[PDB]
Amino acid sequence: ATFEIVNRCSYTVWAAASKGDAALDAGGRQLNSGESWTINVEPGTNGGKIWARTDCYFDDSGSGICKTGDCGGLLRCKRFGRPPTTLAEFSLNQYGKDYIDISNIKGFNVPMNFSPTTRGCRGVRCAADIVGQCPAKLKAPGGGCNDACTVFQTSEYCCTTGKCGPTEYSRFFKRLCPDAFSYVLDKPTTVTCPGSSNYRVTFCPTA
Ligand code: NA
């Protein structure tokens, strides 16, 4: 599948793409405002994620730090990033279908639209000012709005026992972005698309 990753934000982001134990395509790239990066993701990929990183510094070997979304200090991410990160999530060619969603389970840093560029299903978006409205206890100094599991490490927020309900903190993310997952057991906002669809991820879609 092809994913076009577009930075419509007025600031530079460092896109990242991983399936947790490996990079997708090159795994990461700087996107200045307006830039687009096209990657190719192997069919059948399960559990892929794309996210933005902010305020990064890399040396000539691709090593450094980012204030949000850092993936072990690498420009080309092999691993998932440190919260807070708005996440585009996807599993491709799963019994004939692709499954996409946006998640706030690991917090929010940059607004996002995740839409097919081929026929057959709708896109999803989380474009509210979550960072501006973020509850005080969830604000991340580097930027961004952490999820409650990251901040408080309780069984209820992290849904460790497989039972857990919505919380004051999950409801905040859900109020502002009802089409994104707000906690692990949220009612699914996954979209089913035809297998082998192509997609566009746009950071700051309403910019
Ligand atoms: Na998230």
Describe this structure in words.
With 207 residues, the protein is mostly beta strands. It has one domain (1-207). The chain contains 4 helices and 12 strands; from the N terminus they run ββββββββββααααββ. Strands 2, 3, 5, 6, 7, 8 and 11 form a 7-stranded antiparallel β-sheet that branches. Strands 4-1-12-9-10 form a 5-stranded mixed β-sheet, with no helix packed on it. A hairpin with a 7-residue loop joins β9 (112-116) and β10. The chain binds sodium ion. Sodium ion binds at residues 85-87, 103-107. Its main location: cytoplasm. Disulfide bonds join 9-204, 56-66, 71-77, 121-193, 126-177, 134-145, 149-158, 159-164. Belongs to the thaumatin family. Pfam families: Thaumatin (PF00314). This is Thaumatin I.
Domain count: the total is 1
Note the gap between the termini: 27 Å
Provide the β-strand percentage band.
35-45%
Radius of gyration: 16 Å
How many strands, which pairing sense, and closed or not: the largest β-sheet? Answer: 7 strands, antiparallel
In percent, how helical is the residue content?
Answer: 10-25%
Distinct small molecules: sodium ion
Helix segment count? 4
Helix/strand-derived category reads mainly beta
- Give the SSE string: EEEEEEEEEEHHHHEE
Total strands: 12
- Report the principal-axis shape: globular
At a glance:
The chain has 207 residues and is mainly beta. The chain has helices at residues 130-133, 148-152, 155-158, 168-176, and strands at 2-7, 13-18, 23-31, 36-40, 48-58, 64-68, 87-94, 97-103, 112-116, 124-126, 191-194, 199-203.
